[PDB]
Scaffold this active site. Sequence first.
Site, PDB file in Angstrom:
ATOM      1  N   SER A 134      -0.726   3.844  -9.150  1.00 57.31           N
ATOM      2  CA  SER A 134       0.353   4.359  -8.280  1.00 57.31           C
ATOM      3  C   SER A 134      -0.040   5.676  -7.618  1.00 57.31           C
ATOM      4  O   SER A 134      -0.943   5.666  -6.781  1.00 57.31           O
ATOM      5  CB  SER A 134       1.692   4.477  -9.026  1.00 57.31           C
ATOM      6  OG  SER A 134       1.722   3.941 -10.342  1.00 57.31           O
ATOM      7  N   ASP A 381       3.661  -6.678  -5.508  1.00 60.75           N
ATOM      8  CA  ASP A 381       3.943  -5.250  -5.464  1.00 60.75           C
ATOM      9  C   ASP A 381       4.403  -4.766  -4.094  1.00 60.75           C
ATOM     10  O   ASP A 381       3.600  -4.830  -3.149  1.00 60.75           O
ATOM     11  CB  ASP A 381       2.716  -4.459  -5.914  1.00 60.75           C
ATOM     12  CG  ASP A 381       2.969  -2.996  -6.155  1.00 60.75           C
ATOM     13  OD1 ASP A 381       4.125  -2.635  -6.449  1.00 60.75           O
ATOM     14  OD2 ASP A 381       2.012  -2.211  -6.064  1.00 60.75           O
ATOM     15  N   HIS A 406       3.217  -4.599  -9.909  1.00 58.75           N
ATOM     16  CA  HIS A 406       2.697  -3.237  -9.806  1.00 58.75           C
ATOM     17  C   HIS A 406       1.599  -2.950 -10.828  1.00 58.75           C
ATOM     18  O   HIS A 406       1.868  -2.819 -12.022  1.00 58.75           O
ATOM     19  CB  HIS A 406       3.835  -2.168  -9.699  1.00 58.75           C
ATOM     20  CG  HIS A 406       3.365  -0.782  -9.367  1.00 58.75           C
ATOM     21  ND1 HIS A 406       2.787  -0.480  -8.132  1.00 58.75           N
ATOM     22  CD2 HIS A 406       3.391   0.344 -10.127  1.00 58.75           C
ATOM     23  CE1 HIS A 406       2.478   0.807  -8.186  1.00 58.75           C
ATOM     24  NE2 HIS A 406       2.818   1.348  -9.369  1.00 58.75           N
TER      25      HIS A 406
END
Lengths: 442, 442
Positions: A134, A381, A406
Amino acid sequence: KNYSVLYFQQKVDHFGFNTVKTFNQRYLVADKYWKKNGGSILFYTGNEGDIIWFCNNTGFMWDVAEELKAMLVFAEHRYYGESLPFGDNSFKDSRHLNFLTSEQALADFAELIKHLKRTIPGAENQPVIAIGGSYGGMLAAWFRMKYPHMVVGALAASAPIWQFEDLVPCGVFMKIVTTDFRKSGPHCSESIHRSWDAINRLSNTGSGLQWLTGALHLCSPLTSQDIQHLKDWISETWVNLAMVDYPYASNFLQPLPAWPIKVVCQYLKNPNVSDSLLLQNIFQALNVYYNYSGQVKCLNISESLGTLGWSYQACTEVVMPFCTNGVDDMFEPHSWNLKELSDDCFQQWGVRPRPSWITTMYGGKNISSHTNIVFSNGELDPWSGGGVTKDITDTLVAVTISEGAHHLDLRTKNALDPMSVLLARSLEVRHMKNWIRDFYDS
Amino acid sequence: KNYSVLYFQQKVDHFGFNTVKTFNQRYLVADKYWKKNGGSILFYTGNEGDIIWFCNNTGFMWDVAEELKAMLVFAEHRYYGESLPFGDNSFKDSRHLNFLTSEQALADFAELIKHLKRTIPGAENQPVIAIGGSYGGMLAAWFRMKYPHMVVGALAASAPIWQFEDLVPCGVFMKIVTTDFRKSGPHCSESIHRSWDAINRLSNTGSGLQWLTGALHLCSPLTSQDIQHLKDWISETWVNLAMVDYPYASNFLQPLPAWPIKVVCQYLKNPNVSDSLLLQNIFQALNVYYNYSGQVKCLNISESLGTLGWSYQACTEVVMPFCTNGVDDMFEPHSWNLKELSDDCFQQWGVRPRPSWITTMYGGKNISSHTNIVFSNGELDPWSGGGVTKDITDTLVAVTISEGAHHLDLRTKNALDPMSVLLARSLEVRHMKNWIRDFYDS
Ligand SMILES: *[C@@H]1O[C@H](CO)[C@@H](O[C@@H]2O[C@H](CO)[C@@H](O)[C@H](O)[C@H]2NC(C)=O)[C@H](O)[C@H]1NC(C)=O
Ligand SMILES: *[C@@H]1O[C@H](CO)[C@@H](O[C@@H]2O[C@H](CO)[C@@H](O)[C@H](O)[C@H]2NC(C)=O)[C@H](O)[C@H]1NC(C)=O
Ligand SMILES: *[C@@H]1O[C@H](CO)[C@@H](O)[C@H](O)[C@H]1NC(C)=O
Ligand SMILES: *[C@@H]1O[C@H](CO)[C@@H](O)[C@H](O)[C@H]1NC(C)=O
Ligand SMILES: *[C@@H]1O[C@H](CO)[C@@H](O)[C@H](O)[C@H]1NC(C)=O
Ligand SMILES: *[C@@H]1O[C@H](CO)[C@@H](O)[C@H](O)[C@H]1NC(C)=O
Ligand SMILES: *[C@@H]1O[C@H](CO)[C@@H](O)[C@H](O)[C@H]1NC(C)=O
Ligand SMILES: *[C@@H]1O[C@H](CO)[C@@H](O)[C@H](O)[C@H]1NC(C)=O
Ligand SMILES: *[C@@H]1O[C@H](CO)[C@@H](O)[C@H](O)[C@H]1NC(C)=O
Ligand SMILES: *[C@@H]1O[C@H](CO)[C@@H](O)[C@H](O)[C@H]1NC(C)=O
């Protein structure tokens, strides 16, 4: 398995000489499997939360340690966990939060790597690979771009390094969220799409407001001033689900089954439904995310230092344009309003966003000269909308995981992992070992 | 020829959100020869002085403009010339000088390039090449390393990007200064070497102190507390001469003839000399540097905002280790004392040097991953001791100029230019046009 919790004295300001104040940055070391005898260092560039949380959840690092005969380093990001520059006062004022930038974090990572090579006998001439997910991924990628003398390469997992300005359309993220629900069942997106107008109708009378409160099993009675917050919280739910649409059961933020979207899409599916019945189905779906294991008595729509830090960052450097249009997505239209965002940022923090900064610093799309970065992205995602999905060069490569939400690739192996992930996780190690080998042969 | 003087509003702090104060950075534009029709931008990364001075003296840029069909941009460095963040208060305190770093300067250069491509019709998709000499050279090289998305390449002329820590020996610079005098005449270095002990003897009595004052034609009478300053000023002279040992007459800091060292070495040359006669010869040599065109009545050994800024920088980031040993050089021994330097820095500015910083930020010797940087260095230049003299890669290349002092390559063509310079100046354009061509073909 097990690690050592360590601390390293860091300058508060790397970009100025006026302040000489220091602070202890927390970091973790896992040395079993590490061979002093021509091994490597896998360095996690810490992001918006407690370093133990990232340690506990980045399974791929522990899973690949023996194969890469590596030492695992987990470096905490300044202003998160126990790595607070001014302790309790860290979030006091705009003066105290001045030092919370991505450049300061990257500079801490360089100082820390310097320290480990100096401190640990054997480390001195070993290769170091930056790993992140991320924002940690964005950080890992940017760390190779700016400090190639510190890291040989980077594994940038679900890193939206392009989620800025006009690089990508503001709609993309919510378009992908929609696609996830549509492909997860017949009339699922259609059901959610219709739900907003149905909530709006019922919001008109006090009787409808009361009905809605019961149908959704809320904790507090809905007023008309709550309706925008209610819709926001439901939208936040569908969003969360798209990031956690995993091939197996999990307990990250909430106890959830395998393919949670498929499970929620079972409650929708019937198009031939009344608005009253439609909102009962919406509840059933909300119930799987918030109460899958009888966890709660009612759903509380209202909802910390990790969100505070992220809020500051989102108000300064990390200004990602977001919007919904109701045409390419299943949501009510909302435009991207920079002016409005800017004024709320000044109100809470006394600072104003610089929406072009990240692009001037880290280059935007113009990054062809860099080398040794593998950008992995999941097909589910919503964050992949702002990431790299096609190879820039032979060395700046993209890796897509169909059925991957994700950063699935960073998780501990399951049994339920599709071929697309294992195949990608292997391509990751393939590249990593090609960076170690090239380093040692020079 | 002629240019336009322009100003651009810049944030005082690029690394923090607390300050929102701005200032106008001065910059110059030369557009004749620039072709909107597939041309280029030659950007001078301004260093420790007035931008007009660098404009007036970087002849090579004007000399190569037509050939590269380029626009010339000369960007002033913050805290120099008219580009002062806090005006008159800029050098007030450690608080006001906080923003004088190389990172802040590089960030100004990125913002300015962004502005030109946005402002000038035709610029938007053109390639930009960073050019610099001395610290401007270090800046130009570092600008390609950190902002490859802004510049295609860099010409780093006499840029000592390695003059730090243990990268090179602290003796090298003064060893090269010595070599210049030794190769410039028989018994020249030997004469200077012997001179120090002769000055020390005469410094013992008030009669000797008086004799020395007259022999050296000084303005003020020498006391015994002045002797270290006197030797320092003479050492500073030999140093200056090595940087300005040009193949032709020049008037940069002082009116000087062709090969000024050769001219001074004529006054020494005789070994069979007394200490009294030796210091008369030393004067004659000092006389060529300070009075070549009857400029002065006496030599004043005592000797501004450009030196102030440089002093601050030398006290913070640019901490270059220097020393003399009297064995590999013609000077009295002086060791590198970091502790002493640190305390004087705190006394004048209230800041302390970070001797390892530049190395952590810009990488030191570990820069093999970068591309398109041509490092030119003169054989006479004492600064070449801390520069790149052999190719790192096919793209990170070194160019040596035998008979070249401090960045001869950047000067306006003379007639007296040896083949080594013209041959190097051509290799520079060869590489520059290879960066433009590669950019346009992608
Ligand atoms: C959360 O899940 C549990 C179980 O599905 C629910 O708990 C029930 O509570 C009702 C009424 O309060 C009781 O009749 C039963 O004890 C429970 N049922 C079962 C099957 O255990 C709970 O109400 C759920 N939903 C919400 C919105 O809170
Ligand atoms: C600087 O150069 C000039 C010329 O070489 C010197 O000026 C001389 O001054 C003396 C005594 O004051 C006079 O007799 C003459 O007018 C000058 N000589 C010539 C040849 O013009 C000057 O003194 C020089 N040296 C120093 C150390 O100042
Ligand atoms: C990390 O996991 C361990 C057990 O695996 C547990 O004791 C601890 O609560 C976890 N900490 C965080 C921050 O998730
Ligand atoms: C909805 O209704 C019509 C007719 O009443 C029918 O053709 C269609 O299959 C229905 N679908 C569902 C899922 O009930
Ligand atoms: C809802 O959650 C917040 C967040 O901790 C809490 O302060 C508030 O009192 C809660 N109320 C109910 C009824 O759950
Ligand atoms: C940067 O990339 C973009 C789009 O990816 C391209 O149009 C642009 O002109 C590139 N480079 C420069 C130096 O403008
Ligand atoms: C630049 O040169 C011009 C003439 O070529 C002159 O008027 C001016 O004094 C010079 N300025 C500097 C700062 O050297
Ligand atoms: C110095 O003196 C000796 C003998 O008196 C001689 O051999 C030598 O050539 C001399 N050199 C000069 C430059 O006077
Ligand atoms: C020597 O130079 C300085 C620097 O400007 C000046 O202030 C001082 O008074 C000078 N004295 C003489 C005698 O030249
Ligand atoms: C950096 O270069 C030096 C000397 O030029 C070498 O000994 C060193 O180990 C290199 N790299 C790292 C990552 O240590």
